[PDB]
Design an enzyme around this catalytic site. Sequence first.
Site, mmCIF file in Angstrom:
data_model
loop_
_atom_site.group_PDB
_atom_site.id
_atom_site.type_symbol
_atom_site.label_atom_id
_atom_site.label_comp_id
_atom_site.label_asym_id
_atom_site.label_seq_id
_atom_site.Cartn_x
_atom_site.Cartn_y
_atom_site.Cartn_z
ATOM 1 N N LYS B 117 1.091 -10.833 -47.886
ATOM 2 C CA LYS B 117 0.940 -12.203 -48.350
ATOM 3 C C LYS B 117 0.447 -13.165 -47.282
ATOM 4 C CE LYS B 117 4.640 -14.071 -50.408
ATOM 5 N NZ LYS B 117 5.974 -14.471 -50.967
ATOM 6 N N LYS B 159 20.500 -22.194 -47.426
ATOM 7 C CA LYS B 159 21.146 -20.957 -47.687
ATOM 8 C C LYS B 159 21.380 -20.027 -46.576
ATOM 9 C CE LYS B 159 18.605 -21.094 -52.642
ATOM 10 N NZ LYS B 159 17.765 -20.185 -53.291
ATOM 11 N N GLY B 165 25.785 -14.734 -54.583
ATOM 12 C CA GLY B 165 26.650 -15.421 -55.486
ATOM 13 C C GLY B 165 27.030 -16.794 -54.992
ATOM 14 N N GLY B 166 25.897 -17.481 -54.232
ATOM 15 C CA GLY B 166 26.086 -19.013 -54.036
ATOM 16 C C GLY B 166 26.782 -19.410 -52.979
ATOM 17 N N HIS B 209 2.284 -20.582 -64.102
ATOM 18 C CA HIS B 209 1.578 -19.321 -63.462
ATOM 19 C C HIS B 209 0.480 -19.202 -64.065
ATOM 20 C CE1 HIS B 209 3.574 -15.170 -62.261
ATOM 21 N NE2 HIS B 209 1.890 -15.379 -61.959
ATOM 22 N N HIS B 236 10.974 -13.566 -63.297
ATOM 23 C CA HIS B 236 9.633 -13.240 -62.883
ATOM 24 C C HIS B 236 8.744 -12.181 -63.524
ATOM 25 C CE1 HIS B 236 11.128 -15.974 -59.738
ATOM 26 N NE2 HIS B 236 11.778 -15.260 -59.327
ATOM 27 N N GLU B 276 -4.045 -15.488 -58.877
ATOM 28 C CA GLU B 276 -2.922 -16.287 -59.499
ATOM 29 C C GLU B 276 -2.668 -17.454 -58.733
ATOM 30 O OE1 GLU B 276 0.012 -12.596 -61.248
ATOM 31 O OE2 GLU B 276 0.652 -13.597 -59.390
ATOM 32 N N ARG B 293 -6.145 -5.449 -59.155
ATOM 33 C CA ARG B 293 -6.036 -4.586 -60.310
ATOM 34 C C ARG B 293 -6.205 -5.180 -61.568
ATOM 35 N NH1 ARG B 293 -0.989 -5.811 -62.815
ATOM 36 N NH2 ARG B 293 0.302 -6.813 -60.777
#
Lengths: 671, 671, 41
Positions: B117, B159, B165-166, B209, B236, B276, B293
């Site tokens: 990325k 986070k 689980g939050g 998207h 996703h 994308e 691809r």
Amino acid sequence: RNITKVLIANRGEIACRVMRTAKKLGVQTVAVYSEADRNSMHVDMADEAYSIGPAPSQQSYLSMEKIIQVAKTSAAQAIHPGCGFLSENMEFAELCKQEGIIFIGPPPSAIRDMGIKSTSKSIMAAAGVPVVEGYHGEDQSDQCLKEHARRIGYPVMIKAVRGGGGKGMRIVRSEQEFQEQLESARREAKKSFNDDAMLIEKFVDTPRHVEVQVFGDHHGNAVYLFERDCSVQRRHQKIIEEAPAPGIKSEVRKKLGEAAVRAAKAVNYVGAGTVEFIMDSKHNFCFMEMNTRLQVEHPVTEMITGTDLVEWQLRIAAGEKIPLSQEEITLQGHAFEARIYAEDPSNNFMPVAGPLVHLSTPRADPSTRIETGVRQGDEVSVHYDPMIAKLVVWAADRQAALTKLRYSLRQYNIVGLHTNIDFLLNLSGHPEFEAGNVHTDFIPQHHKQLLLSRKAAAKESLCQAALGLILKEKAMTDTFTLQAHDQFSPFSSSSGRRLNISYTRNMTLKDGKNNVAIAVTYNHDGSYSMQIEDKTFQVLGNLYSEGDCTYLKCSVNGVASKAKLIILENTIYLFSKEGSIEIDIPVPKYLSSVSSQETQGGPLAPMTGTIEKVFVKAGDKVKAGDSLMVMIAMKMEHTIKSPKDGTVKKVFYREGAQANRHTPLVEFEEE
Amino acid sequence: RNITKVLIANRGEIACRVMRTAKKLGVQTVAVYSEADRNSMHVDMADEAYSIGPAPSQQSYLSMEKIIQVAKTSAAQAIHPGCGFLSENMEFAELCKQEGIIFIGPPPSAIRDMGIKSTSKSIMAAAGVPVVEGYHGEDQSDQCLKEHARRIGYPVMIKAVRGGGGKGMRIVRSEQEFQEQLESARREAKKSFNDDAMLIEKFVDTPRHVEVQVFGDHHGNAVYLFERDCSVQRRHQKIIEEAPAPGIKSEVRKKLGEAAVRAAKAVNYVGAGTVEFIMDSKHNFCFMEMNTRLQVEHPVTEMITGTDLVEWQLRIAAGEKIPLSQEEITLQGHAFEARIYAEDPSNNFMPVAGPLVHLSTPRADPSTRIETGVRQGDEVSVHYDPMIAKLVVWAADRQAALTKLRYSLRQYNIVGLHTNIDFLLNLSGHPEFEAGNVHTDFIPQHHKQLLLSRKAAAKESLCQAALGLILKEKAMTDTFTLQAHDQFSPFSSSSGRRLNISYTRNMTLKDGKNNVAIAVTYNHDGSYSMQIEDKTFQVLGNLYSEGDCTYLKCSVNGVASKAKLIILENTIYLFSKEGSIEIDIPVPKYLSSVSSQETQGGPLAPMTGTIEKVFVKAGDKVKAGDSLMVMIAMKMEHTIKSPKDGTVKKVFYREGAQANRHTPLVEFEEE
Amino acid sequence: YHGDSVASLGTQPDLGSALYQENYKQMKALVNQLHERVEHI
Ligand SMILES: O=CCCCC[C@@H]1SC[C@@H]2NC(=O)N[C@@H]21
Ligand SMILES: O=CCCCC[C@@H]1SC[C@@H]2NC(=O)N[C@@H]21
């Protein structure tokens, strides 16, 4: 002139071709047939069909009177001659006109003017089209012969006017050697033939048979349709044709066609015509001849233009103007055509007659066209042409088209007589053909590459053949079971199962001259373990039917493949895209008739033909290889030779007699 | 480079897709298969097929060595990787090149450069394509975390780096509350996970998207093919794709593609690529990633352009230039694609494995394309992807295309496992989807309506089910009659006739949990009078076969309708364009085996997976809902729970063991 | 008419049971002994 009914004065594929377009246009179709063609595909395809007499074409398809009589009796307004037979006959085209019947073709004047080479060249030269050629000379003065050799340009060949087999032929590389070689050739010719007349024919370059499809109308407007390469020919017989001709620029072809178009306007040619050109390695072109008909290879032109040339012939013969302007015509893709002949390439391309016992064909798509006048079980005739079918393909690129044709050829299967298909596969895969390096001597030059011997089969092929035989036996068992009351008995299975042991079967198969021993073990799971020599193979498969063709789906040592299976007589035929393999099942001696008649009364006539020479008296001592008789069949000389050293008891034929195929020619004294 | 034979290094629909185009071009096709795929459609479709080992893809389709070995052994000149598996593997593409085999895809450099990325974003930013994104930060200084929160704007989510689980997660709406919320999140994270490292990821919005099909060549010329909306995704996973993207102007898309095209030229990408983009509500777009691809959803692009992208991949891998100029490319109509998954939407879209007992499909027309790699009776595999087929449609208008897809989906029938088809029908009929108001959170936002409960059936449906059962009995009677000598006896009729009275049959059918009592009266004319509760219906119909599917033609109280009837086990399946209804035939107790076996053992493994945790000793007292074991299958955590309050007799597995599906995990003491 | 559903005999044996493991091993040896003796015959 409203053409609502057309008579087709032809047979086979071209008759079916014309009828397809006539029916597409709503025009009624009349066939003619000989006694031998009574059950032919074009007879069944027509709306009406009429007998024109016996099998010989001179007494049937060439009988102008009978064709005109049928056209009158059927009330056909037009005759389509197709190609060959009466299509280039001037007297027939004039007779149609006298009888008020529309001849779908060129006028009788254009047929005449193109039928004589000297006349046609003079017209073409006057029309601007080039006239150059290499020709023989009938003058015999040493000065005249030498002046002609110079004009032709060295090297030249001196030949005797009479005789064959290279006798009296001298090569002359320069002007200085001309006199000595001429006197050498004359002495040999005088000694061999009692004639000293010499010919002077040489062509320094004659590489390409490039031809142009031209179309004319009664109005006199003329158009061309690009060009076709017919350079790949054997004995002048065209074998593979392509359109467009490779390596010719669009500009060059446009000029090439325009010079031909002016000649077409000059004779106001009506209907389709073809200007045949010889093209050199520099793409200079010269007029050779004009074929005053639809060409056999017109489908490659149709595939690159999207036109129907027979449809245009019918419209123009009705009097309508040309459908599309030169500007409207456009070219897309490239196309190829291969002539499928009943010939044996391994035996010098001898024509073969016989039944089409199997005639499977590739599936047809718009790119793939099967021009077939024959169907499975049809018999090729000694009287008519030996062609079986013509295969044409269109593709975005020429290389892709070549790939498609080769894949398609493998799908074509012909059993019952020899064909040129394997020769066409070798030719279409030759590196110089792939490059587009074609010329009229291509087949002679590459002969060794194009013709090749059989190679020993792989053990996997033998395993597949054994599996096919076993599955055929299983199918026979199922067929028997169908008619039995005990339908579900375990005995009806083909498991080959034993108690506490495994059944191993010893099978023998013949590949060429080699006997192959295969030990097949019937496994519980239904597979087979086959051992050939020291190698073991795990084989499993089944039989499935596509259309009318049985297919074998098998896996050998984990490798899966599909092939078409045919078992005829004692030969197993396996057809796969990799290739085709024939395996022979040994024939038990007992079944073979013991003590078959041993004596053979002389070689049997290769075919029905006139006896031209007899070399043996009623009682004559002969040795093997002593020529007994000479026979000419369809203009092809065969010399019969002595099978044994036995003295001749009697002769069944004399000179001038017509001997039927396979009839005894000589009787030999019992020894 | 002449590509005459291609190996397809893939399975299922994409292998069949590639082989269809290869065969259309006359290119020979080589399949590879695992032991589990031996009978798969792509194996039977290929000209040759080779085993690459056992069912797990790591030991078969991901084994580079085996794929290269088969390519060498089959003499394939090229490998088509398809999508997934080795298609984005740089080492495999370099290995193909080292071995002289043409990889049909991008160069190994382009695969590498796009696989990371940070690298891909840096290249895209340098190429002009926008780089903006919301990302987490590994720095833990309160000042650094606050500066980053400010950079991504407010509001932001804090986070914990560790845990699920939050726990340790805080919304921060402004800069003033940041410090208090960070210290709150840290205290909770330290308490729960012994880690106070915090992450800072919060893109303002990621609504669309939108992706662009781009094509490149070895020459370096690059072209785009409009764009596709893939915003409708669940976790996703793309579910419905639509080309073109709704609400994007032709001008905007032209600019969108051009910025992507410059990047494609920058990496000189060869073969198909997809850029994308994330698109906002104002149609500003930013580069997300480039998939190196062919995309799964490439068919929606093909339907709007009239191109074959696999055909272009083969041509460009052979070395030819791009077939059409950007000017030549034109756009007509709109197209949609829905992916048929073996999933249970009602059970949180859990993947389901099992047999395709019934797989009826909509008839295919040029607009309707069924991309199916599976056939009726095929079993979906735990090892491979769960997709069953992909349905694509093209129409003059987007609204018409949506109508066609929904009609087509009803014609698709799948029995034997749960599918997402009814979810796709609800989604494609949702008002916001019809409006084109799509974004990546569409499924989460509308989850309430897209998933719905079963509703009680109408009395007409029950009448049709009873009629179908009666007609099935009649068909069975006819089948028996076929084999009898007394073929024409009146007893063989299904009239149910009596002397001087009418026969009334009491039938019971179960709709959901409700038992429905139907009184059927056999009328003399052949019709049936059915009474359900206080309502009477006049029913008449018959069974007819279309293809392999039996159809029921019935009329209830004068209303005529047609539906597909399938009776499997004790369930009656009725498929009509209105909908599908299942009715259960009660099972007599005597045939119920009358053998209930309580609940031996505990819950069986949901699937074959590693045991990650064991919470029970050899003798432990447990209560219902006490977790016994935790199992991970294909990266999906399942916790086994205690079925009863009985003490545990024994445990059949320990931690790290692989437990097969439906194998007993715990033994409980008999009580 | 032969479309009636009927009950079927048989039950799935406990392959994990020690008795089944022992019985299978003993019977298998007898069968193998039988097979090889026939091979000699
Ligand atoms: O007779 C049938 C056609 C082929 C043989 C005719 C020969 S070729 C030599 C000579 N010159 C002609 O014009 N015709 C004959
Ligand atoms: O292992 C298979 C692919 C999905 C799990 C891989 C995890 S995702 C978190 C961590 N970061 C990576 O790049 N890989 C692992």
